[PDB]
Symmetry: T
């Protein structure tokens, strides 16, 4: 089985890229489900502010999932996005926190993001030698992904500058 | 230590349970829904490719509805990949990059499961909480409506479905 | 040879029959509404003229809701002009060009039929298809609010309807 | 007892008659369009399904344009279901639930009638009411473009219509 | 020293003349139109008060259309109070603060003048410039359409108008 | 205690008392406005039924502005049903399901008060706070314009009102 | 002397009484809701301040919905400050300028009353009129969801309310 | 003939105000017709910029005409806005310029505006003792009316600051 | 082998040839139009730069309109760069980076050709097909108005073009 | 060498002086506002973060209104970084990254000077130019409301402030 | 001569040559894209007929960006029909009124070139101008994604294409 | 005490330094831009007047993007009037009220320094942080296009500039 790919890319390069984007895909799908999970199980005096702050991120990530996925399909492979595909590519523990304080979740989400950002970064430099278009696509996400973590961190920041985890 | 005013803790917990299953269904649904959105092939591609998105958006909406209902009832909704797989009474959508016909066929089967199990949870909710009962009745029509768009592509002149279900 | 997962083949066809009638009712309704839309005259023309449109569009949409529901049940919806005449249990709107009061009073009667028959079909469904019933309950609410609009133009202080 | 400033009492009624027919034609048309909207099946269902709606709404609006024009001429527009059957010069759409190709091919024929009769009414007006004519010329353009959409689904390389 | 490509200076000047009259008509119209908008009284007030605005906006649009057509033809449009009064072949709308019935009655008369004179300028333009001819045919329908909304308030059951025209 | 920078704790407390009264007037008005919205009947029903909604939304807006202006001055707005009767100097709206002609006339009187008391306050404020004065002046133009809308339905072909 | 086609003047009257109380409830609620919207203070001010508006706008609609339903049924709605106090079965919200927590804990208790009384009417309406039951059921879901928002602010990890 | 007026105003005050607003009305009607007149008869290399710049002013003035008019009606009198009413209240010569340069018209419009602004100003202080609401209504127009003249003047301004009429 | 219901394959063919040339004209025009949109320079840059876009967007539509009309008539539209050059009867716009004046004077002459050829087709179409004539007439009014804008920039007080 | 029709040249200058001082104030504000927009941290971070934007955009608009007013009056507005520093009569905002409570308390003070100086200028314009006075009055109402927003976060259950 | 601040007159002239080629490719593409839009026929007509428009609008956009980027570099974009054939290295699109399956396949090849040449240029630009490189990279993702849309209609249940 | 996951703390600081210098540049620009927005005079006044606004709004957005990036990276953005003056390496815009040609020529220069310094930072970020490099690249494309707009007004028929 084999047949088509993007004009200008070797089947080898194409595969390595798709295999990268597929792990990125399952990352997004796990992320936006987890993001909605927090959306719901948050409590505290600052509930509402954080309840909503999350939606724009959920919708934003859900779109990234779609971009990344169809890009894989463009490369010639098959995007896997069923609950199973998520659990099989997933290399981190499932989100532990449930109905708990805003502080609790934000601290936990921070770490989730350290993972997502760090992994994305890696795949960005690994893509320089493979496909620039795909590296660009990922760089855009990183920006928005990174900024949200700031939103998250800013809630835990010490009057000075230290993270109050 | 709280629930909807007028509801008993017993009924509340029973409703929460029904809904939480409904939640993991929807989650698996709008994940699988986008799964074919990407993996369909054929001449009638663009039409079916685009037809799925609205349904995906809708279902994703229903997930949120149901979960904040579970919460409003007092319990705590579970929406992570792990949870969705625990409550999962069926198996992972299998079809990968296949034809429009193959997918729509497999989809019909998935919806039979969803629709049916949802109507069960409806007459079952008639003793527990009418409000919640109403909620699902709402969704049902839309799920049913969509499964029809799916069956229409499989339907044959007279009225017989061509399900490769084998 | 297929129907909604969960309904008996029999329940299906009985629900499908009710709707198909409700469908021709809606089609006659919106044809009729647009009819008086053009044939109303008098000092308060514009107000009542403008009033009909939103309901026409509303019930005009219910037909598409119902017919499509029928299709989802397995049967085939009939929407041709001949079909709407074969399901008619009342007569063709008689009033041609006339006053606002004239049409409004006639429209009241017509709505009495639609609203009543609809109310009856809602009860039969209570044991057939809840999803299907809830659909009509929704419609009824809007049909009912409109008749009130029609009636308000006919009412008189003591809330006695002067037809 | 009144008409458009500038038209003879006679010219008026002749134009008004033409339109009233064009009106029932439009009403039958959009009832019919919505009909096949629900009764189409096959691999390309969604595309053709979605396609009908915009035209339904379009011709659905032409009727309101024409009827209102008639009213402006002095006469009364007839829009009831009975009226549309009394003006019919063709038969009730026969196809029930069938394939896309089935309905499309039938729809072609129907449009041949509407388009043709409309073309004829446009010429008669050239000597009756220019304003009135220009109205139909507009419609014709849209009816014509749609039939092309219907036909494109039936065409085949050599541009030979396989019915 | 210029005109539409394909048009002769003679025909052009003739068209310009027709249009410039059409222009001062429209101007008087959308000024008089707002004049009743303000001066109507009665139980059916709000309905007629609001019904006029769209027509006013429309006509105001037509003024602009016709004037930039005159300009495109090479001549120069006149749109000042002075000009509108020179080309004016009729008299100033007279009705002040009166009933809805009084105004709508007087309005009908004004429109007879407008509509009629416009249809004249239509068959008259069929030899000069088809484009321009089309333009006015467009407006005509809308003017006619509106005069109908006006007559409908005066119409009586059967079909007779109740014009206090005395 | 705190208040607007540049206002004596007094002027500030005087303004607050003034606006607080206005708040109740507005609240009672937009409640009564809606009351009329439902209970009107007659030939010109729809026209007046709808004419009222905008005003209702406007007055509701004004209440939120006045209240928030109060809180800005350092005091505390009271907008519960009780608070609105404690401040209220006029009596409950009497008219229930009556004729549109009757409601308008009644509403006319209601506005005489609203408008008269407002201008009184617009005066007392010229010495206390201009920002607050300019506020009620804007509300006056709109309240005053609505009364006209109301009086126009009661005007006689000449200028005399008929309650 | 006139009601919804299919209801007995008795069944209709009982429905109208239920709603009318519901109407007064909605009016007290959206005034009281807008009341806390102005008097909340605290570090989490802006979030709650704004959160309440949408709920308020929603209840304002529900009241209009319920009232016009009453009228449709034949009776006459009362929505004046005086009528809110005659139907009111609770006390005038009594919290002035105060912390968010204070107001939410108060609001929580208010919604307890509203939701309970509503739930009752819903069940009591199954034997009276289903259309109206459906209406109140929709109202219940949003009122019930809002209350949750209120509570979510007062919860503490182990789902316990801090009143 | 006499019967109603705004609650809180004497029939005398009401009349003087209405008689003021009526002259303001005819001023607006003359203005927006004249404004459209320029809209059409402008030429030059900077045509398009000025052609459009005018519309927002035309629509804006046309609205003022409506406000002012209905305000008169509110006072109890009858707004006159027919071509005749305009010419009868008009105290200035009809707009002279026709198909001519942008510079030509702008210079002429400037003067037209000096008239309109100056008159409005006058009616604003004459209204202090009559009706504040009506003075407010006129003050708003003046602001927007004055700013447009600046737009107009800015086209004739000398590199330094003198008006190049 | 198929055409608009009511036209002879001959009358239809002649119309298709007229349009097809019109189509190529529109394509050259919107490419050339967008061409000057990039190469204009001068103090009055921004005004003209932007003014051209709308015209461009409009012609792009007209081409699509005309082409699909061709297809409707039965024939096949050619809109490739190669086809524009086969139907083209004039020279490739030849002005590069240059002053606004330069480009407008060039554009003026281009529109002279377009408008003339269009006017001819309009008259030539009265005996062929009125629907298509109407289409081109609408196209004429906007093309004719745009040319005016172009000229208005080149005029000098006494309506004289500065080429 | 020119000014508003009907203004003492000496008056216009006096007015243009007040507005210019008002301009730099606005510019300093809509920079400072964004500054605390980026540097706020804390549990209620998001709420205050987003709350500041609408104000920043408002004041930025005011920057423009006032400036373009100064230009109308005949003089020239200075809106560069240097100019804003030259008109300054207060020190640069000294709070870098800090808590929400910290920044809010600092802004509360900043707004005391802005509002106070604005009312001072409103009182001085009374006999200088009513048009420009109205303009500055509008601004005060909005600037004073925003400061309330800032205070409500610092406000104690009994109307006191923690700085 | 002038160019982007920080670019040698050379790099600047090299980029310009590159983009100018791209400009013609885009122009020929969006002309050909529209060509297909009209000449497609078959069962899935509407689906593909419409699928193309967006891409057409996108490519047209890209052409305007590339051209303007060129002018920004100090050179002069050429976008007339002639200029597009002088730069064009591929031949005119052959397929006329054919099957949708055929056009897609043909279009597939067209994109192989467009996409292949682009990436080539995205490379050569890494040394000349990054802003310009990032530009063509964005266009690549979209051009590349459309090809997929095209190839998806030609895919076999497995992964092999069928021209 | 924290930064982007996967960034050398030393690198993050180096990046945050470049961005801060970029921030003050942006702020100085979106003030200066509005400054020439208010002070431009001349025949083409309106065109350039309105042309500057979209840029002002863009750059203002950039102010924010960069700032919030600096905050993400861990440090704190300085956005007050003082700070913008401290980072400055150019003199304050010295053109008060002058011609369009005057201001445009002055801005052309201002933009040389902005673009040049931006590309310098783009080249320095290559091996510092690709995310932040992409961000500054986007800005360059837009900032460079706007400068072309400025030049096209100063540009001579043969691509030269008059300063
Ligand atoms: Na039930
Ligand atoms: Na003819
Ligand atoms: Na004063
Ligand atoms: Na690189």
């Amino acid at each position: 089985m084999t047949s088509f790919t993007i004009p200008g890319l070797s089947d080898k390069k194409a595969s390595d890229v798709a295999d990268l984007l597929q792990k990125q895909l399952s990352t997004y799908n796990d992320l936006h489900l987890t993001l909605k999970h927090v959306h719901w199980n948050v409590v505290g005096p600052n509930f509402i502010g954080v309840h909503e702050m999350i939606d724009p991120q959920v919708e934003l990530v859900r779109g990234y999932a779609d971009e990344v996925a169809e890009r894989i399909a463009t490369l010639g492979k098959s995007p896997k996005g069923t609950p199973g595909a998520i659990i099989k590519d997933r290399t981190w523990d499932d989100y532990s926190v449930e109905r708990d304080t805003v502080q609790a979740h934000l601290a936990a989400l921070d770490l989730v993001y350290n993972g997502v950002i760090e992994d994305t970064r890696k795949s960005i430099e690994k893509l320089e030698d493979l496909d620039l278009v795909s590296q660009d696509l990922l760089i855009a996400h990183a920006g928005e992904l990174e900024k949200f973590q700031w939103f998250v961190r800013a809630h835990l920041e010490s009057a000075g500058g230290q993270l109050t985890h």
